[PDB]
Amino acid sequence: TTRTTDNPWLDARVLNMAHAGGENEAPANTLYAFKRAVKLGANMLELDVQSTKDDQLVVIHNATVDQTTDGTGKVRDLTFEQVHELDAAYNFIPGRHAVPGEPPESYPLRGVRTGEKKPPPGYQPSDFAIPKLADVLEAFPRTPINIEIKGTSDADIPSFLHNAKLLARLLKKTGRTDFIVTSLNDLAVAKFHLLAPDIPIAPGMAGLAAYFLLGVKPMHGTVALQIPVRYQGLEIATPEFIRRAHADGYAVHVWFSGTAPDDEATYNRIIDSCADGLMPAYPALLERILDERGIERPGRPGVDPC
């Protein structure tokens, strides 16, 4: 008798999954941002992973530390100890993620990490550094996490494969499966899924394109399609596409990141289009929206926006 396939992520809605913690309300990919977001109501974290010269997975978006810290160089060239001393709020400006090159007054949390400014109450300086993935897992034992495998450059496929291999090894020892793992690079997803078959995954680019354009279903193990609002001038997070994805048994998670505005009108439209989660840059704002409309949430029934 074939294993009945029932996808639990289809009842995990609606999800507020803080994008990198919420890169417009807090310094991205820091424990501070993550802890802040969950207290303000985030159901799930979205984070990015790279590996250091000594093969530690760290939580950072870009391949270089230059945009988000007071340092310079690539993550792959730095040991975890060199990465962890940097100020990961160095360039943070509310409403604008990380923008280097402004007057020092622009940056309300620059210097908390290195001891020049006092941390917000109840946090420590280390909350404003680049964290080990292992420390994020240890800090969030009962919180789901969406983990995106990053690389060194679009052309450096092995660095994706290297990171996918490390990620599976570390995730497998936790015993947890309340993750969704994905990558823009399709091979890395297949490599992760080979080494850790029990962790839920979402497809990469060619997998999304194949399903969105041709109807070809994604790789075995996919529990959700994780999509931008728009890609190459075409609208992706439409009600039609999400209704078809639910009919095929996948949940849908929508992110913004410049393909559409992070604002109340856009959040409300994507909620209206039946998506199972949004990845806001403004997690407190999305939480205010979900509450006042009384939208249904995991373990809290309510309004269905469909």
Feature table: binding site for Ca(2+): 46, 48, 148
User: Of all helices (H) and strands (E), which one includes residue 146?
Assistant: strand 145-149
Experimental method of this PDB entry: X-ray
Resolution (A): 2.3
**Amino acid identity for residue 280 in this structure:** P
Residue 239: is it exposed, middle or buried by C-beta count within 10 angstroms (0-12/13-18/19+)? middle
Radius of gyration over every alpha carbon of the chain, rounded to an integer in angstroms: 19
Active site annotation includes 19: yes
Span between the terminal Cα atoms of the chain, in Å = 35
Omega before 252 cis (within 30°)? Answer: no
Domain 8-293 has CATH 3.20.20.190: yes
95: helix, coil or strand? Answer: coil
**192: Cα within 13 Å, side-chain hemisphere:** 34
Active site annotation includes 253: no
Q: Which listed residue (19, 84, 193, 253) is catalytic?
A: 19
Q: Which listed residue (61, 84, 193, 253) is catalytic?
A: 61
Feature table: binding site: 46, 48, 148
